[PDB]
Design a protein around this ligand. Structure first.
Ligand SMILES: *[C@@H]1O[C@H](CO)[C@@H](O[C@@H]2O[C@H](CO)[C@@H](O[C@@H]3O[C@H](CO)[C@@H](O)[C@H](O)[C@@H]3O)[C@H](O)[C@H]2NC(C)=O)[C@H](O)[C@H]1NC(C)=O
Ligand SMILES: *[C@@H]1O[C@H](CO)[C@@H](O[C@@H]2O[C@H](CO)[C@@H](O)[C@H](O)[C@H]2NC(C)=O)[C@H](O)[C@H]1NC(C)=O
Ligand SMILES: *[C@@H]1O[C@H](CO)[C@@H](O[C@@H]2O[C@H](CO)[C@@H](O)[C@H](O)[C@H]2NC(C)=O)[C@H](O)[C@H]1NC(C)=O
Ligand code: NAG
Ligand code: NAG
Ligand code: NAG
Lengths: 375, 365
């Protein structure tokens, strides 16, 4: 039983679509499947997002997988709320309780603020990118007010690539006057690399310094540069490579034709792709649960247009949203459970350090228990 | 050019000072062109409702748009304005990243606030910021805090409760000197003032700053007795000749049918901006014509309107001494070369300490 599906993918994201296709083949079955209609665009152009979302809505899509950026959150969430159309994302979780939006990415503030307390930090810088909102920045500042921390928050997201070299050096020159030996690099993979490649040049990767990479993908970057400098490097990873499902997936991943699955050959997998794969699993589980439960989901006719006065949402969307939120399965990221709001719960965020041998896990973190330490 | 130059309008409330000022200012329009208000009442926060209204105005063929936007829907709107090459006038909060088709009739206070804080020997202080687009001004401060080495304890009002204020002020008064900045909206400032009047507003070394472009509108009567310092900014001078005449005529007409808020003043000025641009376009004899195609905003691909570019340039070129100040526009599409009035309110005193200018840096007077 084919169920129509929609897919949005940011321009220049090759690995994620490949993981989407791999998840399709893995979870596809004779009795059930998915028919995805794909669109590629610049997710930071709300106009393009609106056009794609409306086109897919006209194409009678029951749910829409996709990504979004800080300049397209509100458009997407409003459209989903008005049209009662679901949305499944591995992108940053909303700073709210927006409905009809399932979020596959776990929050990070809890683990970050626990880790900063497992190290007894009082005076640290906080380099942040102007993306995925400033929710974690605000959390850090608030906990500073409570705990009398000394935070130097600096933005690096408005730096021109052409003149990148001059600014970073002056930034660290400023930080040196305060003896800022501790830093939190709250940025995506690319800018973390572009910064680590300028800590090295100025020799600030040495015994004295400590870096915390506030990202759910720690290995994703290039850490072979700083393994040996002598400086600490801490971070978080949801994809545990010492697991069974993960190892089997890697067996299927490395043995992949990069001519067909770009990014697939490498042994590493980025958390966005992992969450995309788990998202395919989520959709299949929810839709198959609907089929078993006999819930009636079918578009008898045509959804005229996204823009229609008055807006007339089709009333089976609540069923789809409830099914998507009411699914409990294991996957690459770990255990996937949702709330009535869509945010994930009952998840474990493994913590990692950098050692000359390589990254090694030292503990984990769960919302219920605490920061937990094993090694 | 045709006198049926239809203009749009996006407003949140049918009856308000801003809407009334926009309606009134059109009466003074004696130019050959006739601008239609074509108001649509739309909720600002909801991006979907707004996209519906904006595409409806596209269907009508509207040449230019005036209205408001909030944090949630700034990006959406901005994006449509840079794609269809359609201009959008606004008095709402200005933004750092924007197209050239969005004319923001609200000069940014971030630069002047830095200067005022610099002048006073401010070593450490508390910052209070509303999430309603205030974040752009936060970063600046946090960026200047590092360069110039003062401490800033930010607290958000949107996600702060009464207990939050209580704890913040209790921890604050443990310090000998108490300095506070309050960036807020027009209406949030009144509620926060009420919150501080209850307690912690005694005036014992308390120095508040109000990052609001209009400081006369706010009812600081409760602050004229407790003996507390407050500094603020003003953009509109009622005494000057042009403001005096405009206020006299407008208030006389309205009564024949109070002081406007800064938002209403900017709303009134925007009418003058649009009228000046269209008058200069008719004078310059520029070929403006609206095709009746009225293509759906969601047209793939959406061809830019050919004339819409020149309109922008015209709207950018205009310049005149309006009510608030001298109206001008930068290349990015933002107010340039303006003046602000620094104003301290003593127990019994409204003192114009000085004025801030783009070329100068808080030259006293
Ligand atoms: C303009 O935008 C939207 C829709 O027009 C409005 O935001 C919506 O406001 C309603 C009522 O406050 C919210 O419903 C309530 O939400 C709270 C959570 O905030 C929940 O606890 C309640 O049970 C109830 O569901 C709704 O969630 C909210 N939606 C969004 C997307 O924010 C806004 O108030 C409108 N403004 C005006 C002036 O009409
Ligand atoms: C880099 O990592 C090492 C190992 O974790 C840190 O060294 C420890 O720090 C404690 C903190 O007081 C000191 O007593 C010892 O030097 C080490 N003890 C233990 C149990 O590891 C080092 O401090 C880290 N660098 C920074 C800048 O935090
Ligand atoms: C910046 O604004 C000031 C307004 O105070 C402009 O000064 C006026 O400029 C016009 C145009 O040359 C003159 O006709 C007026 O006599 C000037 N008045 C005053 C009080 O200076 C100034 O020209 C503007 N700067 C630029 C570059 O446009
Ligand atoms: C929820 O978390 C537990 C650990 O707290 C783990 O066994 C698994 O992820 C989930 N188990 C449940 C929900 O029983
Ligand atoms: C408050 O105002 C007084 C003048 O009334 C002046 O000393 C200074 O501006 C402020 N002094 C404080 C807050 O101690
Ligand atoms: C307003 O302008 C008059 C002269 O035009 C001046 O005397 C007065 O100080 C101004 N008011 C403010 C608040 O700048």
């Amino acid at each position: 039983n084919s169920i129509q599906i929609g897919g949005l993918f940011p321009r220049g994201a090759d690995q994620e679509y490949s993981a989407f296709r791999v998840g399709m083949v893995q979870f596809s079955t004779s009795e059930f499947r998915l028919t995805p209609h794909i669109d590629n665009l610049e997710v930071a152009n709300s106009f393009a997002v609106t056009n794609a979302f409306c086109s897919q809505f006209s194409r009678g899509v029951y749910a829409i997988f996709g990504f979004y950026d800080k300049k397209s959150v509100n458009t997407i969430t409003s459209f989903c709320g008005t049209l009662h159309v679901s949305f499944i994302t591995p992108s940053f979780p909303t700073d709210g309780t927006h409905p009809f939006v399932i979020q596959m990415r776990p929050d990070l503030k809890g683990a970050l603020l626990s880790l900063i307390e497992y190290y007894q930090w009082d005076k640290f810088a906080y380099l942040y990118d102007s993306d995925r909102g400033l929710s974690t920045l605000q959390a850090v500042l608030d906990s500073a007010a409570e705990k009398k921390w000394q935070v130097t928050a600096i933005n690096v997201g408005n730096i021109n690539n052409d003149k990148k070299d001059e600014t970073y050096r002056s930034l660290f020159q400023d930080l040196e006057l305060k003896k800022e030996r501790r830093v939190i690099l709250d940025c995506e993979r690319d800018k973390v690399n572009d910064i680590v490649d300028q800590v090295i040049t100025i020799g600030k990767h040495v015994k004295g310094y400590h870096y915390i990479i506030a990202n759910l993908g720690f290995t994703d970057g290039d850490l072979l540069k700083i393994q040996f400098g002598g400086a600490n490097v801490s971070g978080f990873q949801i994809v545990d490579y010492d697991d069974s499902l993960v190892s089997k997936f890697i067996e299927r991943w490395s043995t992949l034709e990069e001519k067909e699955y770009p990014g697939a050959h490498t042994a590493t997998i980025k958390y966005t792709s992992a969450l995309t794969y788990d998202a395919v699993q989520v959709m299949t589980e929810a839709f198959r649960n609907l089929r078993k439960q006999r819930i009636e989901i079918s578009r008898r006719g045509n959804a005229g247009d996204c823009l229609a006065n008055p807006a007339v949402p089709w009333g089976q969307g609540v069923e789809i949203e409830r099914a998507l939120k009411q699914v409990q399965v294991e996957g690459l990221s770990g255990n996937i459970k949702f709330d009535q709001n869509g945010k994930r719960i009952n998840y474990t965020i493994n913590i990692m350090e950098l050692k000359t041998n390589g990254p090694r896990k030292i503990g984990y973190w769960s919302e219920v228990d605490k920061m937990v330490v094993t090694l | 050019f045709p006198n049926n130059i239809q203009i749009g309008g996006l407003f949140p409330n049918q009856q308000s000072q801003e809407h009334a000022a926009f309606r009134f200012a059109l009466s003074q329009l004696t130019e050959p062109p006739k601008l239609l208000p074509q108001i649509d009442i739309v909720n600002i926060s909801d991006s979907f409702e707004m996209t519906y209204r904006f595409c409806s105005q596209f269907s009508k063929g509207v040449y230019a748009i005036f209205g408001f936007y909030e944090r949630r829907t700034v990006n959406m709107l901005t994006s449509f304005c840079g794609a269809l090459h359609v201009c959008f006038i606004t008095p709402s909060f200005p933004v750092d990243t924007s197209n050239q088709f969005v004319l923001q009739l609200r000069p940014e206070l971030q630069e002047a606030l830095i200067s005022i804080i610099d002048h006073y020997k401010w070593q450490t202080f508390v910052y209070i910021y509303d999430a309603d687009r205030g974040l752009s001004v936060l970063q600046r401060v946090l960026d200047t805090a590092a360069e110039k080495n003062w401490q800033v304890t930010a607290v958000n009002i949107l996600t702060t409760t009464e207990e939050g204020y209580r704890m913040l002020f209790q921890d604050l008064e443990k310090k000998k000197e108490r300095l506070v900045v309050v960036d807020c909206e027009s209406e949030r400032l009144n509620a926060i003032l009420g919150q501080i009047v209850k307690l912690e507003k005694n005036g014992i070394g308390y120095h508040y700053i109000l990052a609001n472009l209009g400081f006369m509108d706010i009812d600081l009567n409760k602050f004229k007795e407790s003996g507390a310092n407050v500094t603020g900014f003003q953009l509109v001078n009622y005494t000057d000749t042009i403001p005096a005449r405009i206020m006299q005529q407008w208030r006389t007409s309205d009564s024949r049918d109070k002081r406007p808020k800064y938002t209403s003043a900017l709303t009134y000025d925007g009418v003058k901006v649009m009228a000046e641009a269209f008058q200069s376009l008719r004078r310059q004899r520029i070929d403006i014509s609206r095709r009746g195609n009225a293509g759906d905003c969601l047209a793939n691909p959406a061809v830019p309107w050919g004339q819409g570019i020149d309109i922008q340039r015209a709207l950018q070129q205009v310049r005149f001494e309006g009510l608030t100040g001298n109206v001008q526009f930068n290349e990015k599409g933002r107010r340039t070369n303006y003046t602000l009035h620094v104003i301290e309110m003593k127990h019994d005193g409204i003192r114009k300490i000085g004025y801030w200018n783009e070329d100068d840096k808080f030259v006293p007077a």
